[PDB]
Amino acid sequence: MNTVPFTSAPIEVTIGIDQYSFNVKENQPFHGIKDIPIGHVHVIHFQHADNSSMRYGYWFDCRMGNFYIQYDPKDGLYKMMEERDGAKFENIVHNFKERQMMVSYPKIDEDDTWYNLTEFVQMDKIRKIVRKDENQFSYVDSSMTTVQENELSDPAHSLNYTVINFKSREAIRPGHEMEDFLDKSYYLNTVMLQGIFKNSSNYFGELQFAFLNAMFFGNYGSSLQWHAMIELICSSATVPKHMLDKLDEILYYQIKTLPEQYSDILLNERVWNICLYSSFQKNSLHNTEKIMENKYPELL
Amino acid sequence: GAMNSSNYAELFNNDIKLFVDDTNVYRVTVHKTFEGNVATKAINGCIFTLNPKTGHLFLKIIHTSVWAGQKRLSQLAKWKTAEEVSALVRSLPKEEQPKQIIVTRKAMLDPLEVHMLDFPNIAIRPTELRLPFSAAMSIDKLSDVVMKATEPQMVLFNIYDDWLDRISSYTAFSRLTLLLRALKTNEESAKMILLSDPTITIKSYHLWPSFTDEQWITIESQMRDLILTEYGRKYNV
Numbered sequence: 019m020n021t022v023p024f025t026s027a028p029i030e031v032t033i034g035i036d037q038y039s040f041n042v043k044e045n046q047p048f049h050g051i052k053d054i055p056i057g058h059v060h061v062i063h064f065q066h067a068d069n070s071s072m073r074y075g076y077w078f079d080c081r082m083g084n085f086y087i088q089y090d091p092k093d094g095l096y097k098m099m100e101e102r103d104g105a106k107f108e109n110i111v112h113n114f115k116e117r118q119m120m121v122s123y124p125k126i127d128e129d130d131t132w133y134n135l136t137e138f139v140q141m142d143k144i145r146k147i148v149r150k151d152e153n154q155f156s157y158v159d160s161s162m163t164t165v166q167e168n169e170l171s172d173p174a175h176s177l178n179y180t181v182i183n184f185k186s187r188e189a190i191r192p193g194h195e196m197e198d199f200l201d202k203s204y205y206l207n208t209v210m211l212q213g214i215f216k217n218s219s220n221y222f223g224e225l226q227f228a229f230l231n232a233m234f235f236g237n238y239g240s241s242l243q244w245h246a247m248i249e250l251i252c253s254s255a256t257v258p259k260h261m262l263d264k265l266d267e268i269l270y271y272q273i274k275t276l277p278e279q280y281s282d283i284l285l286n287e288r289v290w291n292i293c294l295y296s297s298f299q300k301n302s303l304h305n306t307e308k309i310m311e312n313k314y315p316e317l318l
Numbered sequence: 319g320a321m322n323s324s325n326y327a328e329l330f331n332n333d334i335k336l337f338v339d340d341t342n343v344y345r346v347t348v349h350k351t352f353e354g355n356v357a358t359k360a361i362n363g364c365i366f367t368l369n370p371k372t373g374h375l376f377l378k379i380i381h382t383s384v385w386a387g388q389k390r391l392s393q394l395a396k397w398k399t400a401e402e403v404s405a406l407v408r409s410l411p412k413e414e415q416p417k418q419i420i421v422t423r424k425a426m427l428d429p430l431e432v433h434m435l436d437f438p439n440i441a442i443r444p445t446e447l448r449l450p451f452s453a454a455m456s457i458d459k460l461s462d463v464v465m466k467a468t469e470p471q472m473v474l475f476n477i478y479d480d481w482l483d484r485i486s487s488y489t490a491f492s493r494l495t496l497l498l499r500a501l502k503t504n505e506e507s508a509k510m511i512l513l514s515d516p517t518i519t520i521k522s523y524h525l526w527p528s529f530t531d532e533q534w535i536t537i538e539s540q541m542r543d544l545i546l547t548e549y550g551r552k553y554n555v
């Protein structure tokens with residue numbers, strides 16, 4: 019088990035760690051989070067008590083370095099930093115562990131939620147969507163725009179999700195207009211799966227990362243990407259049977275985890291009613307349809 | 319965006335534009351079968367593609383063979399319409415291609431937009447006008463050439479005959495829409511109005527009779543009376 023230590027907590031902040039969250043008071047003796055499960059990406063995120071503007075945070079993998087958080091009073095935000103001196107790092111963490119100034123990632127042993135939300139998400143692929151190559155971790159916030167959003171404004175601070183546009187020459191073979199627009203299988207399987215993503219795991223990883231950025235940061239462009247990637251599969255008549263079974267699992271746990279009170283802003287009625295009730299795959303998502311119908315029956 | 323009564327004069331400015339009406343593309347008769355079920359039988363249709371400034375009508379005749387062995391024909395018809403309009407645009411020299419295409423029915427927007435992806439500078443727009451272009455099949459010479467066709471065919475017409483020699487295209491479009499609205503509301507009476515007088519004839523190369531300026535005023539007044547008459551018959555007014 020690894021540890022994200024904190025130099026201090028000079029400003030009152032709500033800290034989230036994956037699907038969990040907690041509150042730290044201004045100048046409380048807080049020095050970070052221990053017992054973080056090795057083997058998964060993680061995200062540590064922040065909402066300042068005195069300005070709920072900008073949720074921001076960091077995607078990281080403790081297998082790729084030793085990371086700590088220090089407040090920077092000039093830029094006014096908790097910053098993730100890498101410490102290259104491993105011995106200095108182990109010594110500072112041990113002192114914070116001995117003084118019990120670190121909270122514990124509260125993972126219930128029966129609970130596989132985080133695995134189920136991040137099954138296909140890999141740090142190497144996060145770093146190609148979020149470009150900042152001098153760091154091993156990736157910063158995301160509520161206001162960052164996506165490459166597609168920008169096509170319709172600083173490219174350095176963009177989310178480079180794969181562009182999906184149903185009324186584009188990429189999506190539509192000349193001479194197969196009606197066929198490709200009403201059945202997206204060409205676009206899904208040849209352009210995206212074979213062409214761009216290479217495999218379904220990489221596709222699912224971007225989908226899962228888009229959902230998590232939408233949920234943890236209220237990132238609107240991420241929410242658009244998540245829904246676009248669902249719609250592309252559901253609107254395809256030909257999908258590998260294993261892909262549909264796995265999609266049902268992926269969406270089930272995303273709908274299960276979603277705050278009930280954020281449903282109005284994280285879920286697109288048009289997309290979901292189409293996917294569950296009109297699309298080619300309207301019958302291939304039994305678990306997701308059941309949780310949606312019992313939990314968000316209004317949206318439908 | 320959508321074309322309506324505020325930006326109505328845009329139809330007659332110098333930006334090339336076409337109206338596309340698909341309401342006569344897929345045409346059927348409905349009848350009982352020997353077994354007492356119901357069957358449809360398709361008949362020839364047409365795409366109505368009109369330059370409102372010039373009167374040029376590109377009438378693409380849709381022969382019943384295009385439906386042979388196809389499913390979901392009402393949906394296919396929107397895509398076949400879009401396919402034919404796109405091929406028409408591609409067959410025009412660059413300086414004759416439209417800058418906008420206005421579809422009379424919103425269900426045409428996505429089919430045409432998708433067929434015209436290669437032309438990102440051509441705007442595809444709906445309209446809030448209720449245009450009577452479905453009545454084009456009530457014009458004898460157009461109905462004739464559609465029903466006689468034995469194969470796909472494009473026939474070219476000026477739907478304003480020679481009116482632009484004497485009136486603006488605003489006025490000619492208004493005369494056209496009033497004629498077509500009347501033919502749609504009461505076809506028999508509209509045709510009675512147009513052809514009661516034997517002394518007034520239709521030139522071989524025209525669609526409508528050769529009315530003088532004063533006779534057109536009389537005719538237009540009679541068409542407005544027909545529409546009002548039918549409105550009162552309908553609603554018991």
Ligand SMILES: Cc1ccccc1CNC(=O)C1(C(=O)O)CC1
Nearest residue numbers: 035037038039040121122123124
């Ligand atoms: C104090 C603390 C420290 C680290 C992480 C979380 C917490 C408290 N939050 C929770 O325990 C739960 C949540 O939904 O957030 C599981 C219920």
Ligand SMILES: Cc1ccccc1CNC(=O)C1(C(=O)O)CC1
Nearest residue numbers: 023024025086101106107110111
């Ligand atoms: C938390 C942590 C972990 C690894 C490296 C640096 C830090 C922050 N550095 C410190 O807090 C101290 C320092 O002299 O550096 C005071 C001990």
